[PDB]
Amino acid sequence: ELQKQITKIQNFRVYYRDSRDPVWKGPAKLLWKGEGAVVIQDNSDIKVVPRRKAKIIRDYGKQMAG
Amino acid sequence: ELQKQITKIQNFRVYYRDSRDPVWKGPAKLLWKGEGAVVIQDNSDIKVVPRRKAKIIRDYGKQMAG
Amino acid sequence: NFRVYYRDSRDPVWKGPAKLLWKGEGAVVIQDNSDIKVVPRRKAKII
Amino acid sequence: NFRVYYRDSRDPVWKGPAKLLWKGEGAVVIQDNSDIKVVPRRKAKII
Amino acid sequence: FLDGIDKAQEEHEKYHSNWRAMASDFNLPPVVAKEIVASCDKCQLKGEAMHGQVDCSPGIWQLDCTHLEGKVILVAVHVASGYIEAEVIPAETGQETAYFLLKLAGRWPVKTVHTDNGSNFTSTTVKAACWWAGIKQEFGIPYNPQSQGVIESMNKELKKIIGQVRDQAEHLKTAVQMAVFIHNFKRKGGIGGYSAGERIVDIIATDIQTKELQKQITKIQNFRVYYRKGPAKLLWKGEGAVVIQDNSDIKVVPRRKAKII
Amino acid sequence: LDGIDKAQEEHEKYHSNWRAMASDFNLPPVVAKEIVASCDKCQSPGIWQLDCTHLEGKVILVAVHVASGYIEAEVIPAETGQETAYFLLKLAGRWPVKTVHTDNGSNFTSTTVKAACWWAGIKQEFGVIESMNKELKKIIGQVRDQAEHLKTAVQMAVFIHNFKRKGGIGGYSAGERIVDIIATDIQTKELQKQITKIQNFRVYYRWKGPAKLLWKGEGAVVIQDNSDIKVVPRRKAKIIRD
Amino acid sequence: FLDGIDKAQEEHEKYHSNWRAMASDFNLPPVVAKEIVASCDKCQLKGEAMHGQVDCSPGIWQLDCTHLEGKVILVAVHVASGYIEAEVIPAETGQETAYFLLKLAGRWPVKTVHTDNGSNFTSTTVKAACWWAGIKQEFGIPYNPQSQGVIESMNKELKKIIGQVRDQAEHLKTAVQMAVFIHNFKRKGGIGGYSAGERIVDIIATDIQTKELQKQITKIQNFRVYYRKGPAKLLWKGEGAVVIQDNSDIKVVPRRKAKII
Amino acid sequence: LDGIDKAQEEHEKYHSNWRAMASDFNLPPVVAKEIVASCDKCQSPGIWQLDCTHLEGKVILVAVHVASGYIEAEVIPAETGQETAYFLLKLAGRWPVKTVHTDNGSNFTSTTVKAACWWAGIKQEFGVIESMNKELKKIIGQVRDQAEHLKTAVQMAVFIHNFKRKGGIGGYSAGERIVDIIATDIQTKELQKQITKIQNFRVYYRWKGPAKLLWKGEGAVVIQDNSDIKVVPRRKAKIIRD
DNA sequence: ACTGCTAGAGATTTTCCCG
DNA sequence: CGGGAAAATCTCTAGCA
DNA sequence: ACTGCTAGAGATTTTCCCG
DNA sequence: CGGGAAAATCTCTAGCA
Ligand SMILES: C[C@@H]1CCO[C@H]2Cn3cc(C(=O)NCc4ccc(F)cc4F)c(=O)c(O)c3C(=O)N12
Ligand SMILES: C[C@@H]1CCO[C@H]2Cn3cc(C(=O)NCc4ccc(F)cc4F)c(=O)c(O)c3C(=O)N12
Ligand SMILES: [Mg+2]
Ligand SMILES: [Mg+2]
Ligand SMILES: [Mg+2]
Ligand SMILES: [Mg+2]
Ligand SMILES: [Zn+2]
Ligand SMILES: [Zn+2]
């Protein structure tokens, strides 16, 4: 039930930036999504990113590929 | 005689750039000066730099200060 | 309190000092002689 | 041999291909229809 | 330094020497020279060396009007994806800007439009068109195209493609639609190797799917967490760390010194 | 890897599709695709429909995505081939249009529309369009008084139809449906691309005969030999291109 | 790929898809798609992302004419040091450019002048003034102020100082000379914490001193070196490495496999 | 460090200056300065001279660096205070002009020249100028035919005088001499700055009485106590500010 | 209270592939 | 584990009134 | 065959200074 | 050897037709 839903929410890749770095940070793992913030995991680090600085996709291309 | 002259030529600081780095490299030690090239020592490394990419000074302020 | 000097709009002459009302990431809101203006942080210095 | 496409002088339209005569650090000398021109390397691609 | 400072202001009132020159000429600590410069109004002439970061939420679009061959091209872009819409219009008028905006809002979920302060966007006719479709208008700091970095960058890619295909069309509107097609579906790269069309599809489908999934997750997973405080609402748990939202403030706490109930 | 046999069994029992096996058991999509393709007992998103309605003396030119009911329409000055081809180039730039169905009307069989379809890569072929024309006309009649010109009313009707009216099995609107269907086609195309990439590779494992390649994992290599899926360590198999 | 390549060129001839889009849509290796793009003339629209490096020898000066309050200001700069000279002149004319250049060459050792291709610098009257003082003229690639980065950057600092002191002078020439003074002697920093005046003094004195010193060193230290070749002329030795000049080619060799005679 | 005693001896023998001791024995300039300042038996570059010559009906306004013979001149339209003050502001922007000697002529005692000197920081005081005027006139007479106007000829003469005519003890031209003299003044000013910086520090070593500070090296601290220079390890002395 | 970005070209580091 | 080649990342630029 | 740079503002790392 | 403060370095920007 719930665990399938959580492992599905963690299948989406998140591209984000920090408040003073102009370069986009590579695909993290989406843990939780909200109206104003998303919670991600990037290299065994848990960051909270505003919604306006994050791009969340699935990569229908790496899915279909393992 | 000659050794005083060499240790005097090595008292001048050289600021230089490489052919694809826009930042100026810190003060090296001038070993030999020529019409088209200067030979410097930067951090126990001997580089040959064109004359047009090198600024050679003494730093009248650090002399007068040890 | 903070003094803010700024470059408002298509004008090269820097103006100031103005009161800092709000500092966001990238832009600031200031008050310069009962006139509220929004200036990007590229065009303002805050002291 | 090399093909060089370039942006000569106050003109947005890229021109080329031209023969590469000399590659310096920052600029190149090319030949485009019996016309020798000196183009900076910001304004030229060499293939 | 009382004699060294009084002479330094007297010199700054004339030459406006920077903090270093006054530190060398009057034997001042760097802080004092920097203070003397910082108190001079005539020396505050430079901003700080940074750039902001535009909004890249899934519902934000940047619009702008660019000009080509005497004609007006109204261009829009989906900021999160790079998907562009464009149209040659006879005039920069709020009427046709509103028509363009209504067409756009009818084809895609447009939550917010970001534009500069051109008269066609600040028009009372676009305000009515954005109110009807439930769109939010964000105008930028006047005379700052950097606030429209995305659409202004798209004004260059679009014009660049048009010159590549201009000789396959008699009229400029055909070349504009060709360029829209080519950008959206024939240029790949970016954050997923996608094209702009694939990327907008992914962005929008992912938004819907994640909203539904997290709705289910919150409907089921209902816990309260005490840490170090009040019953913060649980958001996520695992890997020796817990994420919670205490009074609308999301913070990350380790599994230690935190109990889930 | 370890669930390949379970997926084979679940297909031989329930005749499921590869998406479920790949989601339920955690298999690369290519392996589940081969599982569903090994049983012979177990054997649209780019098609739009075009037509023209007449209303208040002007010509509305409507386009429907058949799979989703999503509608693209606009008022044109003249029912001609120039404006039809322009509408079609626009649509093809907005959505991936692979086929368009029309009613052999004069504006649709013109050389300009044919050339536009050729450039865009659209295949021209000569009752959903009628029902959606009826629904669009009903919505237009509803919302007509909120605008002065007809083209504005048509765009408000298109907005209402695509995003405000919901229905079907899950209660989704035409916009969400078209987005989901296009995402599904993107997945299908990516899978076809990967299958086509790997199909020109042969694997020699343990040496045994050549085998078809399915997946080149980080700790394993999946192969299909004599209509049977087997797993071999990477160091125990050599992959060559043919 | 013969069927995949023939279809890719047919698609590129229409849409001009970049190498990635054609690698994804036609199953091509990156090299083949990049080749198909590289052979299209209509796609070669972007130069390489670098910048050059101007000449900063001790004798190079960059000159330029800038405008302020309807008046013409002829500005020069010593590239190695940042020392500027400036003057308000009534007209951008080769006559007064030549007067400025002769004054400059009379006050400092000017070996070479770098300028853009304005008519006053490309004038036959400056050619005579530069020939008389023994100056070498380097003109830049036309319509490329980046080739004058130093003097163009100095056109901004000079104008910036003038606005700081403009209200201490009735005329603009007085403010220009005030700004020259302030820049050259009241602004410290750079490669030695110097001002422009101190730095030009150091550069020039160091040039003279090093030329004299190395003349003596070569007059005394006279050796030939064999390495791995011919009798290369010795330049420097010490710290387990030898620097020599073999047929006008300076290279560094270690002390091993090298004998000094 | 180790040569301080040798330098003291060489001064008590030959009365040398601190530049030589600092160059010969390898001492920080402050230590040699104190050595030369401890003996009471052992006890210009910013001064220019202005004047006006008349030639061919025009007024040439000449400036000489007394220490080097370097010359700055130019033809002015009128022998007035505006042009004199402009010439002086120009010169002060080019070279570090600390003092200017003039001949109390009307143009030199004007309020505009006084205000220019005040702004630039020049001290006004009211036979080298005459000899250099003679030499400049001789050169001008030589080179006059190579130009049409007189101002151009004056600048060619200034170029010749400053860089083409060489003489003196070492055979250097006026340009090299002025550059060397200004470099020497830069060294002198930097040394005075460092001495002034360190003179407000007192050192307590081994605790003994306070001592004047001279140098804070990387492996030593040099101090002067009771007119005697001693060396102490950094860990053996504490420096405080007073 | 709001905000530079995008895509391409060359350079340099990572990953993979067979020994 | 060791080179080489190919892929991924990094760096940096013009143009967008 | 020739060529972006300069100075200031804020951030971040180094060095030094007394324990 | 250990923090804190001050100094040095690094990063990045507008304006220069
Ligand atoms: C009359 C409206 C309202 C008020 O202002 C004007 C003037 N303007 C100027 C540019 C422009 O300067 N682009 C160059 C650029 C410079 C920097 C950057 F980051 C991005 C850039 F695109 C525009 O694009 C633009 O749309 C306008 C415009 O619309 N208006
Ligand atoms: C008639 C002469 C001869 C032919 O060309 C024109 C036009 N021009 C244009 C600029 C200018 O665009 N400065 C802005 C800028 C841009 C980029 C950069 F790296 C540096 C910069 F200063 C000049 O400064 C300048 O002197 C001239 C000029 O002199 N001429
Ligand atoms: Mg605009
Ligand atoms: Mg714009
Ligand atoms: Mg110019
Ligand atoms: Mg210029
Ligand atoms: Zn000031
Ligand atoms: Zn092409």
mmCIF file with all atom_site columns, N, CA, C and O in Angstrom, chain B residues 5 12 15 17-18 21 24 32-33 41 51-53 55-56 58-60, chain G residues 53 55-58 80 191 194 202 205-207 210-211 213-214 216 239 250:
data_model
loop_
_atom_site.group_PDB
_atom_site.id
_atom_site.type_symbol
_atom_site.label_atom_id
_atom_site.label_alt_id
_atom_site.label_comp_id
_atom_site.label_asym_id
_atom_site.label_entity_id
_atom_site.label_seq_id
_atom_site.pdbx_PDB_ins_code
_atom_site.Cartn_x
_atom_site.Cartn_y
_atom_site.Cartn_z
_atom_site.occupancy
_atom_site.B_iso_or_equiv
_atom_site.pdbx_formal_charge
_atom_site.auth_seq_id
_atom_site.auth_comp_id
_atom_site.auth_asym_id
_atom_site.auth_atom_id
_atom_site.pdbx_PDB_model_num
ATOM 1   N N  . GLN B 1 5   ? 75.392 39.354 -8.985  1.00 0.00 ? 5   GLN B N  1
ATOM 2   C CA . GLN B 1 5   ? 74.528 39.748 -10.089 1.00 0.00 ? 5   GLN B CA 1
ATOM 3   C C  . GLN B 1 5   ? 73.365 38.778 -10.254 1.00 0.00 ? 5   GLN B C  1
ATOM 4   O O  . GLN B 1 5   ? 72.230 39.195 -10.513 1.00 0.00 ? 5   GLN B O  1
ATOM 5   N N  . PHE B 1 12  ? 63.819 40.125 -8.379  1.00 0.00 ? 12  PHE B N  1
ATOM 6   C CA . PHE B 1 12  ? 62.667 40.743 -9.010  1.00 0.00 ? 12  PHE B CA 1
ATOM 7   C C  . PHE B 1 12  ? 61.506 39.761 -9.082  1.00 0.00 ? 12  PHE B C  1
ATOM 8   O O  . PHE B 1 12  ? 61.677 38.582 -9.398  1.00 0.00 ? 12  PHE B O  1
ATOM 9   N N  . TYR B 1 15  ? 54.992 38.722 -12.531 1.00 0.00 ? 15  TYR B N  1
ATOM 10  C CA . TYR B 1 15  ? 53.579 38.388 -12.652 1.00 0.00 ? 15  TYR B CA 1
ATOM 11  C C  . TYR B 1 15  ? 53.290 38.032 -14.101 1.00 0.00 ? 15  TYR B C  1
ATOM 12  O O  . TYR B 1 15  ? 53.658 38.777 -15.011 1.00 0.00 ? 15  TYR B O  1
ATOM 13  N N  . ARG B 1 17  ? 50.825 35.332 -17.027 1.00 0.00 ? 17  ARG B N  1
ATOM 14  C CA . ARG B 1 17  ? 49.618 34.592 -17.347 1.00 0.00 ? 17  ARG B CA 1
ATOM 15  C C  . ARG B 1 17  ? 49.962 33.477 -18.319 1.00 0.00 ? 17  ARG B C  1
ATOM 16  O O  . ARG B 1 17  ? 50.949 33.556 -19.052 1.00 0.00 ? 17  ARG B O  1
ATOM 17  N N  . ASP B 1 18  ? 49.137 32.439 -18.318 1.00 0.00 ? 18  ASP B N  1
ATOM 18  C CA . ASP B 1 18  ? 49.252 31.370 -19.296 1.00 0.00 ? 18  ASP B CA 1
ATOM 19  C C  . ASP B 1 18  ? 48.302 31.625 -20.461 1.00 0.00 ? 18  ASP B C  1
ATOM 20  O O  . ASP B 1 18  ? 47.401 32.463 -20.390 1.00 0.00 ? 18  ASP B O  1
ATOM 21  N N  . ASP B 1 21  ? 44.527 31.104 -19.511 1.00 0.00 ? 21  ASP B N  1
ATOM 22  C CA . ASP B 1 21  ? 44.020 31.463 -18.189 1.00 0.00 ? 21  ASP B CA 1
ATOM 23  C C  . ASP B 1 21  ? 43.995 32.980 -18.079 1.00 0.00 ? 21  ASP B C  1
ATOM 24  O O  . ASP B 1 21  ? 45.054 33.625 -18.228 1.00 0.00 ? 21  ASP B O  1
ATOM 25  N N  . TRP B 1 24  ? 45.969 36.448 -13.370 1.00 0.00 ? 24  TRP B N  1
ATOM 26  C CA . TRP B 1 24  ? 47.399 36.700 -13.271 1.00 0.00 ? 24  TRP B CA 1
ATOM 27  C C  . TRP B 1 24  ? 47.997 35.839 -12.169 1.00 0.00 ? 24  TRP B C  1
ATOM 28  O O  . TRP B 1 24  ? 47.457 35.768 -11.061 1.00 0.00 ? 24  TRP B O  1
ATOM 29  N N  . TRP B 1 32  ? 66.041 34.493 -15.558 1.00 0.00 ? 32  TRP B N  1
ATOM 30  C CA . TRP B 1 32  ? 66.719 34.969 -16.751 1.00 0.00 ? 32  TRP B CA 1
ATOM 31  C C  . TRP B 1 32  ? 65.734 35.798 -17.555 1.00 0.00 ? 32  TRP B C  1
ATOM 32  O O  . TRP B 1 32  ? 64.565 35.434 -17.669 1.00 0.00 ? 32  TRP B O  1
ATOM 33  N N  . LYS B 1 33  ? 66.208 36.914 -18.102 1.00 0.00 ? 33  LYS B N  1
ATOM 34  C CA . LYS B 1 33  ? 65.383 37.776 -18.933 1.00 0.00 ? 33  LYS B CA 1
ATOM 35  C C  . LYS B 1 33  ? 65.967 37.837 -20.334 1.00 0.00 ? 33  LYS B C  1
ATOM 36  O O  . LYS B 1 33  ? 67.187 37.899 -20.502 1.00 0.00 ? 33  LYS B O  1
ATOM 37  N N  . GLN B 1 41  ? 60.714 31.095 -11.775 1.00 0.00 ? 41  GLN B N  1
ATOM 38  C CA . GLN B 1 41  ? 60.537 29.971 -10.868 1.00 0.00 ? 41  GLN B CA 1
ATOM 39  C C  . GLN B 1 41  ? 59.321 30.239 -10.002 1.00 0.00 ? 41  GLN B C  1
ATOM 40  O O  . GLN B 1 41  ? 59.338 31.151 -9.167  1.00 0.00 ? 41  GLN B O  1
ATOM 41  N N  . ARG B 1 51  ? 57.627 37.473 -23.244 1.00 0.00 ? 51  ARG B N  1
ATOM 42  C CA . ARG B 1 51  ? 57.802 38.792 -22.647 1.00 0.00 ? 51  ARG B CA 1
ATOM 43  C C  . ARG B 1 51  ? 56.487 39.556 -22.607 1.00 0.00 ? 51  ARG B C  1
ATOM 44  O O  . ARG B 1 51  ? 56.272 40.396 -21.727 1.00 0.00 ? 51  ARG B O  1
ATOM 45  N N  . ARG B 1 52  ? 55.585 39.268 -23.543 1.00 0.00 ? 52  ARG B N  1
ATOM 46  C CA . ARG B 1 52  ? 54.343 40.018 -23.659 1.00 0.00 ? 52  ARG B CA 1
ATOM 47  C C  . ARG B 1 52  ? 53.285 39.577 -22.662 1.00 0.00 ? 52  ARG B C  1
ATOM 48  O O  . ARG B 1 52  ? 52.221 40.197 -22.606 1.00 0.00 ? 52  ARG B O  1
ATOM 49  N N  . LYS B 1 53  ? 53.543 38.523 -21.894 1.00 0.00 ? 53  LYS B N  1
ATOM 50  C CA . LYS B 1 53  ? 52.601 38.008 -20.913 1.00 0.00 ? 53  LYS B CA 1
ATOM 51  C C  . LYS B 1 53  ? 53.132 38.123 -19.494 1.00 0.00 ? 53  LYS B C  1
ATOM 52  O O  . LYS B 1 53  ? 52.548 37.542 -18.576 1.00 0.00 ? 53  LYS B O  1
ATOM 53  N N  . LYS B 1 55  ? 54.808 40.646 -16.300 1.00 0.00 ? 55  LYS B N  1
ATOM 54  C CA . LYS B 1 55  ? 55.089 41.934 -15.671 1.00 0.00 ? 55  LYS B CA 1
ATOM 55  C C  . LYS B 1 55  ? 56.157 41.699 -14.611 1.00 0.00 ? 55  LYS B C  1
ATOM 56  O O  . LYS B 1 55  ? 55.955 40.909 -13.687 1.00 0.00 ? 55  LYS B O  1
ATOM 57  N N  . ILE B 1 56  ? 57.292 42.381 -14.741 1.00 0.00 ? 56  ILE B N  1
ATOM 58  C CA . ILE B 1 56  ? 58.425 42.204 -13.842 1.00 0.00 ? 56  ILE B CA 1
ATOM 59  C C  . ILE B 1 56  ? 58.625 43.487 -13.049 1.00 0.00 ? 56  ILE B C  1
ATOM 60  O O  . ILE B 1 56  ? 58.868 44.552 -13.626 1.00 0.00 ? 56  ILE B O  1
ATOM 61  N N  . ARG B 1 58  ? 59.942 44.847 -8.727  1.00 0.00 ? 58  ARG B N  1
ATOM 62  C CA . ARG B 1 58  ? 60.756 44.498 -7.559  1.00 0.00 ? 58  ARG B CA 1
ATOM 63  C C  . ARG B 1 58  ? 59.927 44.543 -6.322  1.00 0.00 ? 58  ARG B C  1
ATOM 64  O O  . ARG B 1 58  ? 60.151 43.761 -5.451  1.00 0.00 ? 58  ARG B O  1
ATOM 65  N N  . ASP B 1 59  ? 58.946 45.410 -6.249  1.00 0.00 ? 59  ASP B N  1
ATOM 66  C CA . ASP B 1 59  ? 58.051 45.591 -5.098  1.00 0.00 ? 59  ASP B CA 1
ATOM 67  C C  . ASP B 1 59  ? 58.777 46.369 -4.097  1.00 0.00 ? 59  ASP B C  1
ATOM 68  O O  . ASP B 1 59  ? 59.151 45.865 -3.093  1.00 0.00 ? 59  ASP B O  1
ATOM 69  N N  . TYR B 1 60  ? 58.981 47.625 -4.387  1.00 0.00 ? 60  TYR B N  1
ATOM 70  C CA . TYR B 1 60  ? 59.739 48.477 -3.526  1.00 0.00 ? 60  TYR B CA 1
ATOM 71  C C  . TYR B 1 60  ? 59.251 48.474 -2.141  1.00 0.00 ? 60  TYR B C  1
ATOM 72  O O  . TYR B 1 60  ? 59.854 49.049 -1.299  1.00 0.00 ? 60  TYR B O  1
ATOM 73  N N  . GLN G 2 53  ? 44.563 37.468 -25.089 1.00 0.00 ? 53  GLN G N  1
ATOM 74  C CA . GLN G 2 53  ? 45.334 38.185 -24.086 1.00 0.00 ? 53  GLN G CA 1
ATOM 75  C C  . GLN G 2 53  ? 46.171 39.248 -24.774 1.00 0.00 ? 53  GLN G C  1
ATOM 76  O O  . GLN G 2 53  ? 47.087 38.922 -25.529 1.00 0.00 ? 53  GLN G O  1
ATOM 77  N N  . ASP G 2 55  ? 48.819 42.358 -25.556 1.00 0.00 ? 55  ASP G N  1
ATOM 78  C CA . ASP G 2 55  ? 50.231 42.535 -25.255 1.00 0.00 ? 55  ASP G CA 1
ATOM 79  C C  . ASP G 2 55  ? 50.405 43.457 -24.055 1.00 0.00 ? 55  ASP G C  1
ATOM 80  O O  . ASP G 2 55  ? 49.821 44.542 -23.997 1.00 0.00 ? 55  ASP G O  1
ATOM 81  N N  . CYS G 2 56  ? 51.207 43.017 -23.085 1.00 0.00 ? 56  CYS G N  1
ATOM 82  C CA . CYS G 2 56  ? 51.454 43.797 -21.877 1.00 0.00 ? 56  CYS G CA 1
ATOM 83  C C  . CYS G 2 56  ? 52.945 44.025 -21.661 1.00 0.00 ? 56  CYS G C  1
ATOM 84  O O  . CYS G 2 56  ? 53.409 44.115 -20.523 1.00 0.00 ? 56  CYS G O  1
ATOM 85  N N  . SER G 2 57  ? 53.702 44.137 -22.748 1.00 0.00 ? 57  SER G N  1
ATOM 86  C CA . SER G 2 57  ? 55.114 44.467 -22.665 1.00 0.00 ? 57  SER G CA 1
ATOM 87  C C  . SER G 2 57  ? 55.294 45.862 -22.062 1.00 0.00 ? 57  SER G C  1
ATOM 88  O O  . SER G 2 57  ? 54.344 46.648 -22.014 1.00 0.00 ? 57  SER G O  1
ATOM 89  N N  . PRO G 2 58  ? 56.499 46.200 -21.594 1.00 0.00 ? 58  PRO G N  1
ATOM 90  C CA . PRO G 2 58  ? 56.676 47.501 -20.929 1.00 0.00 ? 58  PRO G CA 1
ATOM 91  C C  . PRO G 2 58  ? 56.533 48.692 -21.856 1.00 0.00 ? 58  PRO G C  1
ATOM 92  O O  . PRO G 2 58  ? 56.244 49.793 -21.375 1.00 0.00 ? 58  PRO G O  1
ATOM 93  N N  . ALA G 2 80  ? 51.268 47.768 -18.956 1.00 0.00 ? 80  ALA G N  1
ATOM 94  C CA . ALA G 2 80  ? 51.893 46.983 -17.897 1.00 0.00 ? 80  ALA G CA 1
ATOM 95  C C  . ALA G 2 80  ? 51.579 47.546 -16.521 1.00 0.00 ? 80  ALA G C  1
ATOM 96  O O  . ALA G 2 80  ? 51.553 46.809 -15.530 1.00 0.00 ? 80  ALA G O  1
ATOM 97  N N  . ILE G 2 191 ? 49.046 44.727 -8.744  1.00 0.00 ? 191 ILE G N  1
ATOM 98  C CA . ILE G 2 191 ? 50.028 43.656 -8.634  1.00 0.00 ? 191 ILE G CA 1
ATOM 99  C C  . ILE G 2 191 ? 51.121 43.967 -7.621  1.00 0.00 ? 191 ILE G C  1
ATOM 100 O O  . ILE G 2 191 ? 52.040 43.157 -7.447  1.00 0.00 ? 191 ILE G O  1
ATOM 101 N N  . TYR G 2 194 ? 50.553 49.067 -5.512  1.00 0.00 ? 194 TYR G N  1
ATOM 102 C CA . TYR G 2 194 ? 51.028 50.349 -5.993  1.00 0.00 ? 194 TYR G CA 1
ATOM 103 C C  . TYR G 2 194 ? 49.868 51.216 -6.456  1.00 0.00 ? 194 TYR G C  1
ATOM 104 O O  . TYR G 2 194 ? 48.728 50.766 -6.580  1.00 0.00 ? 194 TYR G O  1
ATOM 105 N N  . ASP G 2 202 ? 58.248 51.531 -11.146 1.00 0.00 ? 202 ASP G N  1
ATOM 106 C CA . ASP G 2 202 ? 58.831 50.221 -10.887 1.00 0.00 ? 202 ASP G CA 1
ATOM 107 C C  . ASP G 2 202 ? 59.061 49.451 -12.179 1.00 0.00 ? 202 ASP G C  1
ATOM 108 O O  . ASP G 2 202 ? 60.136 48.882 -12.375 1.00 0.00 ? 202 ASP G O  1
ATOM 109 N N  . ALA G 2 205 ? 62.049 51.225 -14.193 1.00 0.00 ? 205 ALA G N  1
ATOM 110 C CA . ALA G 2 205 ? 63.324 51.060 -13.509 1.00 0.00 ? 205 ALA G CA 1
ATOM 111 C C  . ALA G 2 205 ? 63.753 49.605 -13.500 1.00 0.00 ? 205 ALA G C  1
ATOM 112 O O  . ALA G 2 205 ? 64.936 49.298 -13.669 1.00 0.00 ? 205 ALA G O  1
ATOM 113 N N  . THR G 2 206 ? 62.800 48.690 -13.324 1.00 0.00 ? 206 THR G N  1
ATOM 114 C CA . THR G 2 206 ? 63.111 47.271 -13.325 1.00 0.00 ? 206 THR G CA 1
ATOM 115 C C  . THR G 2 206 ? 63.553 46.813 -14.702 1.00 0.00 ? 206 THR G C  1
ATOM 116 O O  . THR G 2 206 ? 64.466 45.995 -14.822 1.00 0.00 ? 206 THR G O  1
ATOM 117 N N  . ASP G 2 207 ? 62.925 47.334 -15.755 1.00 0.00 ? 207 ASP G N  1
ATOM 118 C CA . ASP G 2 207 ? 63.359 46.998 -17.103 1.00 0.00 ? 207 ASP G CA 1
ATOM 119 C C  . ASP G 2 207 ? 64.810 47.403 -17.319 1.00 0.00 ? 207 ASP G C  1
ATOM 120 O O  . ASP G 2 207 ? 65.631 46.598 -17.781 1.00 0.00 ? 207 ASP G O  1
ATOM 121 N N  . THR G 2 210 ? 67.203 45.244 -15.006 1.00 0.00 ? 210 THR G N  1
ATOM 122 C CA . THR G 2 210 ? 67.329 43.851 -15.405 1.00 0.00 ? 210 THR G CA 1
ATOM 123 C C  . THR G 2 210 ? 68.078 43.724 -16.718 1.00 0.00 ? 210 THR G C  1
ATOM 124 O O  . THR G 2 210 ? 68.856 42.783 -16.898 1.00 0.00 ? 210 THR G O  1
ATOM 125 N N  . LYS G 2 211 ? 67.874 44.661 -17.646 1.00 0.00 ? 211 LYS G N  1
ATOM 126 C CA . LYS G 2 211 ? 68.648 44.624 -18.880 1.00 0.00 ? 211 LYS G CA 1
ATOM 127 C C  . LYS G 2 211 ? 70.135 44.768 -18.585 1.00 0.00 ? 211 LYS G C  1
ATOM 128 O O  . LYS G 2 211 ? 70.959 44.009 -19.108 1.00 0.00 ? 211 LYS G O  1
ATOM 129 N N  . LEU G 2 213 ? 71.736 44.159 -15.665 1.00 0.00 ? 213 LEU G N  1
ATOM 130 C CA . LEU G 2 213 ? 72.190 42.993 -14.916 1.00 0.00 ? 213 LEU G CA 1
ATOM 131 C C  . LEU G 2 213 ? 72.401 41.793 -15.827 1.00 0.00 ? 213 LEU G C  1
ATOM 132 O O  . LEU G 2 213 ? 73.436 41.125 -15.750 1.00 0.00 ? 213 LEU G O  1
ATOM 133 N N  . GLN G 2 214 ? 71.423 41.489 -16.683 1.00 0.00 ? 214 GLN G N  1
ATOM 134 C CA . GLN G 2 214 ? 71.545 40.325 -17.547 1.00 0.00 ? 214 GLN G CA 1
ATOM 135 C C  . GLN G 2 214 ? 72.609 40.532 -18.615 1.00 0.00 ? 214 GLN G C  1
ATOM 136 O O  . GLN G 2 214 ? 73.249 39.563 -19.035 1.00 0.00 ? 214 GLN G O  1
ATOM 137 N N  . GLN G 2 216 ? 75.463 42.086 -18.005 1.00 0.00 ? 216 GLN G N  1
ATOM 138 C CA . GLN G 2 216 ? 76.664 41.690 -17.272 1.00 0.00 ? 216 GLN G CA 1
ATOM 139 C C  . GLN G 2 216 ? 76.741 40.177 -17.100 1.00 0.00 ? 216 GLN G C  1
ATOM 140 O O  . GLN G 2 216 ? 77.814 39.578 -17.269 1.00 0.00 ? 216 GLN G O  1
ATOM 141 N N  . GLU G 2 239 ? 69.490 24.203 -8.826  1.00 0.00 ? 239 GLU G N  1
ATOM 142 C CA . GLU G 2 239 ? 68.349 23.449 -8.305  1.00 0.00 ? 239 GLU G CA 1
ATOM 143 C C  . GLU G 2 239 ? 68.060 22.198 -9.131  1.00 0.00 ? 239 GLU G C  1
ATOM 144 O O  . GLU G 2 239 ? 66.901 21.824 -9.327  1.00 0.00 ? 239 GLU G O  1
ATOM 145 N N  . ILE G 2 250 ? 64.107 28.244 -26.331 1.00 0.00 ? 250 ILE G N  1
ATOM 146 C CA . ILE G 2 250 ? 64.378 28.091 -24.906 1.00 0.00 ? 250 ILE G CA 1
ATOM 147 C C  . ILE G 2 250 ? 63.595 26.903 -24.370 1.00 0.00 ? 250 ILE G C  1
ATOM 148 O O  . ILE G 2 250 ? 62.369 26.834 -24.507 1.00 0.00 ? 250 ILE G O  1
#
